[PDB]
Amino acid sequence: MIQGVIQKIAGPAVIAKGMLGARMYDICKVGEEGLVGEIIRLDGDTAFVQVYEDTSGLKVGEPVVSTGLPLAVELGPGMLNGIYDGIQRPLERIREKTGIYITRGVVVHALDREKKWAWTPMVKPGDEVRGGMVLGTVPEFGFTHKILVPPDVRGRVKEVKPAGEYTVEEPVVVLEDGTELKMYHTWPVRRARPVQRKLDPNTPFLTGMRILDVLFPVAMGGTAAIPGPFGAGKSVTQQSLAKWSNADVVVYVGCGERGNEMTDVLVEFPELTDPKTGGPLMHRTVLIANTSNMPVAAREASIYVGVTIAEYFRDQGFSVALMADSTSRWAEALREISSRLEEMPAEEGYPPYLAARLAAFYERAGKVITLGGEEGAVTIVGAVSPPGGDMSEPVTQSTLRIVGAFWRLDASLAFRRHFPAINWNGSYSLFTSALDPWYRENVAEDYPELRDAISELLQREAGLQEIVQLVGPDALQDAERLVIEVGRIIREDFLQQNAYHEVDAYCSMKKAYGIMKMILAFYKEAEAAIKRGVSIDEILQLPVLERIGRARYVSEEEFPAYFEEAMKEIQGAFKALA
Amino acid sequence: PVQRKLDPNTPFLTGMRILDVLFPVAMGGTAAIPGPFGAGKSVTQQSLAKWSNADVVVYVGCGERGNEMTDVLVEFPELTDPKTGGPLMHRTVLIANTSNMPVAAREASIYVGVTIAEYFRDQGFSVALMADSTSRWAEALREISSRLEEMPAEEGYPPYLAARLAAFYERAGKVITLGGEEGAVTIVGAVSP
Amino acid sequence: IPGIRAQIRFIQQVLEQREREDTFRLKRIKGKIEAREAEEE
Amino acid sequence: DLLKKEYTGITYISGPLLFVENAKDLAYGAIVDIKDGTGRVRGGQVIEVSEEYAVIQVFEETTGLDLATTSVSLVEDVARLGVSKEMLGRRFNGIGKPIDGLPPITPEKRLPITGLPLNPVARRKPEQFIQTGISTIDVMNTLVRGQKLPIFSGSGLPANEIAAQIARQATVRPDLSGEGEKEEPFAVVFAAMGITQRELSYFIQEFERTGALSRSVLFLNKADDPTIERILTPRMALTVAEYLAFEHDYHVLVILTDMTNYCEALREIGAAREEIPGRRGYPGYMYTDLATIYERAGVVEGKKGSVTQIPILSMPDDDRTHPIPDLTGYITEGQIQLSRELHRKGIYPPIDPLPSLSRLMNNGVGKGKTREDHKQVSDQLYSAYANGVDIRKLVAIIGEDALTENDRRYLQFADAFERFFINQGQQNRSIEESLQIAWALLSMLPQGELKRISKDHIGKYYGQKLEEIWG
Amino acid sequence: TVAEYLAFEHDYHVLVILTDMTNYCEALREIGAAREEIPGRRGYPGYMYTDLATIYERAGVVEGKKGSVTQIPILSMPDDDRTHPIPDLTGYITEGQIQLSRELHRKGIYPPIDPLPSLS
Amino acid sequence: ESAGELLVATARTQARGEVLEEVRRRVREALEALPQKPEWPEVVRKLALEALEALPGAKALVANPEDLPHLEALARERGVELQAEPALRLGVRAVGAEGKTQVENSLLARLDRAWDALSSKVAQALWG
Amino acid sequence: TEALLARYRERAEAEAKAVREKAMARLDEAVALVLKEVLP
C-alpha cells in the first residue's frame, strides 16, 4: 500500500509526496477524511491527484493512500429504479444519512447488501463456464436479471446453490478452482467490455417524434448528437426521448446540468407507464446525476459510469438507450483540470487528447453479439452546448466527424414557440438507406418514396424562399405559391408536435405514414387543379385543410377510420367541383 | 470624505441647446462624450468650459494637443465671466499633460485634477471637471502593465481598468460637506474609440 | 452590397485580433513552463 | 483555539496577491488578517498553499504595506458567517459588517458561506404561481415560486425599476389554487455588487416608500469599495437567504444587482494567477463558479420556505452571445430580456416577449391554477406576434400599399400589442385583467386563424373589444 | 531637427513634407515586434499614438520668435479605409485633413481634392 | 406604518448592545488585574506551556520583566531562551526558529478571540 | 395621525427599560461565566 503526504493544494488538485510505486489512474484517499481522487501524473517522487470532492479546509501534511485499483463500478441486481452521483453512490442513502445537503466523505455501497433476491440456478456441477455465460436469474421489477460470469473467469463448476433468497454477497457458484462467483462483480470504467462480434445496424430506434423518426432516423445501434443554444429546448427533447422510446432500459446521464431536471424526472417517472411491459416508467431507468454545483472532476467519472452500466445491460441481451445530458460540460471539466496541470493547450484551451476521448466514448455504442451468444445494443444520444451558439467550436466539430445522425436546434424556431424546433436545413442522417427494408416490411411498401417526395418538396420550397425574399411572396406565379403553401402546411401540420398534449406526445409510425400520404395527395390534386385555371386563393379556402391540419390530434386507435374518410374527402374536394 | 451624498435636483447648464434640452445632466451627475476624430470634440469641450454655470472649472488635458492648452491660455483672459464681472481665466484651473510629454504622468494628472475639484467642492462651490481624454489614461495603464509582464484583458488592457474608471467617476455628486455647507462636482469625461 | 461587405470585413478584423491575442498568450505560457522546468532542472 | 500565530516573512506584493513563506499551518481557503506598520488590519483568503509558501488574495487595497513590518495571522480555517433572525432590518457592507450604526448581531449559528449542494432527492418541484402585476411576465413568461429568472438588461435601460416594481407588486394568489390563505409577504435579501450612488439612492428610496425595509437584509458593495470584495457578497447574501428559508420557513426573494461586476472581479483575480482563459479572458471555471451561486435556490421537500432569485446583468454591447449572458442563460431557467428599440418608443416596461423564456412556466398554470386557457392564449399570442414582426420585415422591402388584407390585420395586431399589452407603465394588473386584454387583442384576428386554441375556449372568450376594457 | 534649428535659430519659415507615413508605420511595426511587445489593433504596436505624437507635435510657432514650422504629412489610407489605425491615429493628432477622391480622379480632374470631407 | 415598529426594534437592539458591551468591559477589567492574584504564576506557566506546545522548535520566549522570574524555572527544561519586554502584558509570546514565526498567548488576545464565540451564551444566559 | 408615533415612542422606551433591568438581574453571573471560559 503506497502512501505519502500532501505537499501542495490548489483548487481540485493535490500533489502528493513520497508516492513512489503508484500507478497512473489509480484511486487514492486524500487527507485524513478520506476523499477520493485519481492519479493523473507521476513525477519523480510525487504524484498529481484530482480530487472528486470539495477540498476546502485541507491542510499540508495529511496522509494520502493509494488503493492500487482504477475506478470501477459494481454490476449486479439492484441498479434499476435508482439514482446515483458521479462515482456510483446511492443518493437516497446519502440523503437519509446527511440530511438535505451533500456532505463530503460518505462511504456507501452501490448495491444494497441486505435485500434478498430470488436466486434460480441454471448450471449443473461439472459444467464448463466461460466468461460471459449466464449462471442463473433473479426477478427484478418485471425483468429477468441474468447473472453473468465476469469476462475474465473460466473453469468448471464444483458447487451451485439450490435456490431461494440470498443477498448479493452470497457465493452462488464456486468453481473447482476455488473462486466464488457472487451475484455482482466490478469492472474498470475505462475498459470497454468485450463482445463476440459487431453487427450491422438495420432496425430503427423509435423515438416517438415525427421529424426524427421520419426525416432523420437512427438505427438501433447508432449515435446521434443534438447541439443547440440555450433556450432552444434540449431538455424537453431529451426527456421526451426518455419517455417514449422503445428501448428496454434507459440510462440517463445528467453530466453538469441543472438539478431541477433531475428532480422532474424523479417526481414524474413513477406516475407514467412503461409502453412495452405496462409497468411503471421508473422501473426501467437508471439516473446518474452530477449537477452543476457538484465537484468538477466527477463529470467524466459520471460519463464513464453511465456507459459502463449501459454496456452491462447490453451484455444481458437488452436494448439500452444512453442519454448524455452534455458533453460540453465534460470538455470544460477537462480544460479546468488542464489549467493547473500547466499543460500547453489546443484551440480555445481544451487539452489535446479531447477528440481522442470523445471518439473512444462514442465508439462503445453498437449492436453486438454478446459473449453469451445473444443480441443486445447500446444507442447513444449526446447533447452539445456550443458556447455562444457557435457551431464551429472544437467540441461540435469533433462530434460531427463521429456521429451517425445530427439533429440541429435553431433559435429562430424556438422564439416562435414552434417545437421541436429542429433546423431542417442543417440536419442530416446517414442511416436511411440501410433502414429501408425494415420500413418496406413493417410500415408500408412505398414508405421510402413518400419520404423522398416530402424531402424533395421541402428542398424545392427552400430554393424558392431565396426569390421570395427579394421580390415578396405575392410576385410568384401560382405554381410556386402552391409550393410555398404546401411547405407551410408540411411544416405546421406534420413536423410540429405538442409535447404536453395528451395524444400528440407520442406518434406511431403508421400515423406518420398516413399524414404524409394525405398531404401528398392533396398537393398533387391541387397542382392538377391549377393546371385547369383554378385560382390559388379558393384552393386555400378548401375546408379539407382543416381535416389535414387536425389529423395529428387523433388517437392511435381512432386514426385509420379518420384517414380513410379523409382520403376520399380529399378526392371529392376536387373531383366534385369538376 | 463628506458628510452625506445628496440627490441632484438642479440642471448643469452647458449653453448648447441640444444638450440642455434633449439630454440634460444634473448638477452632481456624470456624462460621457465619445467621438471619432473629425467630429469637433475639441470645440464642444471648449464651449462647455466657456459658458457653463459652474463656479469653478477644472480642465484636465490628459494626453491631447498642446495648441488646445494654448487656445485656453490666450483667449480666456479676454472673455468675461457671466456670473461675476471678472475675466474667465480667473475661475479656471488647467492641468496640461500633452501628447508628447511623459506617458506615465497622464494618470497622475487625472487624479490631481479630481482631487483639486474635490477640494473646491469642500469649500462650498460647485465645480465642473472636464477630463479631456480617458483613452489616453487607459493607454498609459496598458503600457505600464506591459512592462510588468501581466496577463491582459480583451484588447491588451489590464483586467482592472473598469475598477479604476468606476472609482474615478464615483467621486462626483452633490454633497453636504464636512463644514456643513453644500457643494457639488460634475464630471464630463471624453473618450476616443 | 457595400453594407454587407463592410460588416464582413469588420467581423474578420475582430476574429483575427482575437487569434493574435491568444497566440501571444500561448507563447508566454510555453516560455513559462520551460523556465520553471529548467529552474528545477 | 484561542492563541494567535503570526507569520512574518512576506516575500511578494503586487496587485491583489501576496505570497508568504513558511506557512504550511494555514488551511486551503482560510481567512487571515493582514496588519501593517500602522496597526490597520485588512483581510484576505488563502487560495494556494504548499510546503514552501502560501498565496493570499487581499480584499482591501494594498496601499501602505511593506515587506519588513506587515504580519499575517489566522482567523479561521473555513470562511463562515454569523446568521440570525435578528438581521431582518439591517445593512451590511460587502463582507458582512454593519453600516447602519447599530451594534453587531449575536449569531445563533455560524455557517460556511460557500454552502453545500442540495440533494437532488431532497428537492421539490416548484409549482406556486407568482403574480407580478406585469402582463408580459404573467401571461407569457410566468414566474413560479422557487425559480431562477434573470433580467438581461442593457446600459441605459431601466432594469432597476422593473426589479423594484416586481418586489413591490409580487404576491401569490392562493384563491386560484385553492390552497392556503396566509399570503405571508416576501422577505427580500438584496445584494449589490459595484453599485453606483444614483442607483443605490433609487433602491433605498423605493424600499422606504413601500415599507419593505423592516423585512429586508441589505448587502451593499458600492462602486468605490474594493473590487475583490465582490467575490464574497453573493455568497453571504445566499447564505443568509438559505438560512431564513430552510430554518424559519420564510419565503425569500433574492435580488443580485449586477453580475457583470462580479464577473469583472472574477476575471481580475483569475488573470493575476494566469488561468487558462475562456472566451474573452474570463477564466475557464467561470461556469462552475456562477453555478455555485445560481443553484442555491428552489424548494425543499418537506419544508415550507422557498428561495427565488432575480439576478440582473447588463449584456455589454446588447450582445446575447457575450460570455456572461451566455453562461447565465445556460444555468438559470429562462430569462427576461429587455429591448432597446421598445425603450426608444417610450414603452415601459420594454420587455420583448420573443427572446424571453420561462422554463418552469408549465408547472404552475392551467386548471386548478390561474385559468384553463392560460397556456393556449400565451402561445397563440406568440404566433401572432411573430407573424406581425415578419410582415414588418416584408413591408420594409415592398412597401405598405402592396400588402394583402390579412397581412394588414397582422401588422395592426403587432402594433396594438406593443402599445396596449406591453406598455402598462407602473400599474398593477391582476392576472384576469391580463387575460382579458389578451383576448381583446386576439379578437382582432379572424376566428378561423386562432389555430392553437381549442373550440370551446374560443366560444366562451372570443369577441371582446378593446374600447370596452378602456376607452 | 533640421527644421527646428532653422526656424528657431535663424528666423526661417519652414515647411516640412513627410512623404509617406504609411511606410513609417510598417517600419515601426516591424521593429516593435522584434522586442516582443503587446500587439495592437492590426499588429501595430500598442504605443503608435505616442510615437506619432512625438513627431507631429514638433511643429508650431513660439512666442517672442519669428520662425515657424508647418507640417504636411502624406499617407495612403489602405483599401481607402478611413478607420484603419494609421489615418485614424493621425486624425486625432493633426488639425484637419485634406482628402483625395477617386471619382474626381476617374473624371480626369487634377489635383483630385474632394472639398466636402476636407477641413482645416 | 412600520416606522414606529422600526423605532421600537432599534431601541431594543441598541439596548441589548449596551448591556453586552458592559459585560465585556466588566470582564476586561476583571482580567487586567490578575497579576496581583496568587494563581498568577501557575496560569502563566500553563500559558507559556501551551504556547511552546504550539511552536515545535521555538528559539526564545518574550515576556514582561515584572513576571520574568515566574518564567525561568520552566524554559531551562527544554532549552528555549528567555527575553523580557515591557509592552507584552498578561501573557507570553514565543518566537519560531527562523525568526519569521511567532505565537502570542496574551489574555486580552484570547478574550478577543473567544468573545464572539461566547456572545450567544451570554445572551441566552443573561436574558433567556 | 401622530397618536401612532406617540404610542410607539412609549412602547420603545418601555421595552428599553424592561430589557435593561432584566439584564442587570443576572449580569453578575454572565460576566463570571465569560471569565471562567476565557481562562486556560
F103-115 exposure pattern, b = at least 16 Cβ within 10 A, e = fewer: bbbbbebbbeeeb
Q: Kindly state whether B160 is in contact with chain D, defined as any CB-CB distance less than 8 angstroms.
A: yes
In the structure, do chain D and chain B come into contact, i.e. share 3 or more CB pairs under 8 Å? yes
G37 among the known binding-site residues? Answer: yes
Method: cryo-EM
Q: Kindly state whether C38 is in contact with chain D, defined as any CB-CB distance less than 8 angstroms.
A: no
Which candidate from E39, E54, E92 shows the least CB-CB separation from B192?
E92
Classify burial at D448, counting beta carbons within 10 Å of its beta carbon; exposed 0-12, middle 13-18, buried 19 or more: exposed
CB-CB under 8 Å, D279 with A387? yes
Distance between CA atoms of residues E81 and A133, nearest Å: 75
* Neighbouring subunits of G (3+ Cβ pairs under 8 A): F
SS3 for E12? Answer: coil
Distance between CA atoms of residues B48 and D379, nearest Å: 53
CB-CB under 8 Å, E88 with B37? yes
Indicate whether D388 belongs to any domain: yes
Indicate whether D41 belongs to any domain: yes
Question: Is the separation of the CB atoms in D118 and D303 below 8 Å?
Answer: no
Q: Kindly state whether B50 is in contact with chain E, defined as any CB-CB distance less than 8 angstroms.
A: no
Go through chain A and tell me how many residues it has.
578
Closest CA to A80 of A382, A319, A379, A310: A310
Distance between CA atoms of residues A354 and A335, nearest Å: 9
Question: Is the separation of the CB atoms in B186 and B133 below 8 Å?
Answer: no
Grid cell in block for residue E112 = 483630385
CA-nearest residue of chain C to E37? Answer: C24
Q: Can you name the residues that pair with A307 across neighbouring β-strands?
A: none
Q: Give the strand order in the sheet containing A143-148.
A: A143-148, A134-140, A117-121, A164-166
Complete DSSP assignment for chain F: -THHHHHHHHHHHHHHHHHHHHHHHHHHHHHTTGGGSTTHHHHHHHHHHHHHHHSTT--EEEE-GGGGGGGSTTTTTTT---EE-SS--SS-EEE-TTSSEEEE--HHHHHHHHHHHHHHHHHHHHT-
Grid cell in block for residue D60 = 482591501
Indicate whether D127 belongs to any domain: yes
Indicate whether D285 belongs to any domain: yes
Indicate whether D469 belongs to any domain: no
CB-CB under 8 Å, E60 with B38? no
Which residues does chain B have within 8 Å of residue C28's beta carbon, measured at their own beta carbons?
Answer: 151
How many other CB atoms are found less than 10 A from the CB of residue E103?
Answer: 9
Q: Kindly state whether B152 is in contact with chain C, defined as any CB-CB distance less than 8 angstroms.
A: yes
Question: Is the separation of the CB atoms in B163 and D264 below 8 Å?
Answer: yes
Distance between CA atoms of residues D423 and D417, nearest Å: 9
CB-CB under 8 Å, E41 with C20? no
Q: Kindly state whether C30 is in contact with chain D, defined as any CB-CB distance less than 8 angstroms.
A: no
Indicate whether D471 belongs to any domain: no
- Going by their DSSP bridges, the two strands B126-131 and D17-21 should be labelled as unpaired
Percent helix, strand, coil in chain A, to 5, is 35, 25, 40
HSE (CB half, 13 Å, CA atoms) of D258? 24
Closest CA to D148 of D347, D290, D15, D24: D290
Resolution (A): 3.1
Complete DSSP assignment for A164-223: EEE-TTS--EEETTS-EE-S-EEEETTSPPP-SEE----SB---S-HHHHHTS--BTT-E
Q: At what angle do helices D323-331 and D259-271 cross, to 10 degrees?
A: 110
Q: Kindly state whether A342 is in contact with chain C, defined as any CB-CB distance less than 8 angstroms.
A: yes
Residue C38 C-alpha, separation from nearest chain B C-alpha, in angstroms: 20
Count of domains forming chain D: 1
Distance between CA atoms of residues A109 and A186, nearest Å: 12
Closest CA to F97 of F60, F65, F125: F60
Q: Kindly state whether C20 is in contact with chain D, defined as any CB-CB distance less than 8 angstroms.
A: no
Q: Can you name the residues that pair with A47 across neighbouring β-strands?
A: A16, A42
E73-84 exposure pattern, b = at least 16 Cβ within 10 A, e = fewer: bebebeeeeeeb
Distance between CA atoms of residues E88 and B37, nearest Å: 7
Classify burial at A216, counting beta carbons within 10 Å of its beta carbon; exposed 0-12, middle 13-18, buried 19 or more: buried
SS3 for D121? Answer: coil
SS3 for A130? Answer: strand
* Cβ-proximal residues to D18 (8 Å cutoff; 6+ apart), any chain: D10, D12, D34, D44, D55, D56, D57, D58, D62, D65, D72
Grid cell in block for residue A20 = 513512489
Question: Is the separation of the CB atoms in A404 and A230 below 8 Å?
Answer: no
Please state whether the peptide bond connecting residue A420 to the residue before it is cis, i.e. omega within 30 degrees of 0: yes
- G16, containing H or E segment: helix G3-38
Distance between CA atoms of residues A307 and A303, nearest Å: 6
Q: Can you name the residues that pair with A186 across neighbouring β-strands?
A: A74
Grid cell in block for residue D241 = 437567504
In the structure, do chain D and chain F come into contact, i.e. share 3 or more CB pairs under 8 Å? yes
Indicate whether D168 belongs to any domain: yes
Indicate whether D468 belongs to any domain: no
Structural domain boundaries, residue D239: 4-462
Amino acid at B158: P
Amino acid at C37: E
What separation, in Å, do the N-terminal and C-terminal C-alpha atoms of chain C show?
60
Measured in whole angstroms, the distance separating CA A150 from the mean position of its chain's CA atoms is 26
- Going by their DSSP bridges, the two strands B182-191 and B126-131 should be labelled as parallel
3-state secondary structure E19-85: CCHHHHHHHHHHHHHHHCCCCCCCCCCCCHHHHHHHHHCCCECCCCCCCEEEEEECCCCHHHCCCCH
CB-CB under 8 Å, D402 with A474? yes
Distance between CA atoms of residues D422 and D424, nearest Å: 6
Residue D153 C-alpha, separation from nearest chain B C-alpha, in angstroms: 19
Please state whether the peptide bond connecting residue E85 to the residue before it is cis, i.e. omega within 30 degrees of 0: no
- Going by their DSSP bridges, the two strands B182-191 and B173-176 should be labelled as antiparallel
CB-CB under 8 Å, C28 with B151? yes
B residues 105-134 closer than 8 Å to D (CB): none
Classify burial at F25, counting beta carbons within 10 Å of its beta carbon; exposed 0-12, middle 13-18, buried 19 or more: exposed
CB-CB under 8 Å, A342 with C26? no
- Signed CA dihedral, E31, E34, E37, E38: sign only: positive
Those residues of chain G whose CB sits closer than 8 Å to some CB in chain F are: 4-5, 7-9, 11-13, 15-16, 19-20, 22-24, 26-27, 29-31, 33-35, 37-40
Which residues does chain B have within 8 Å of residue C17's beta carbon, measured at their own beta carbons?
Answer: 155
CB-CB under 8 Å, C24 with E38? yes
Classify burial at D161, counting beta carbons within 10 Å of its beta carbon; exposed 0-12, middle 13-18, buried 19 or more: middle
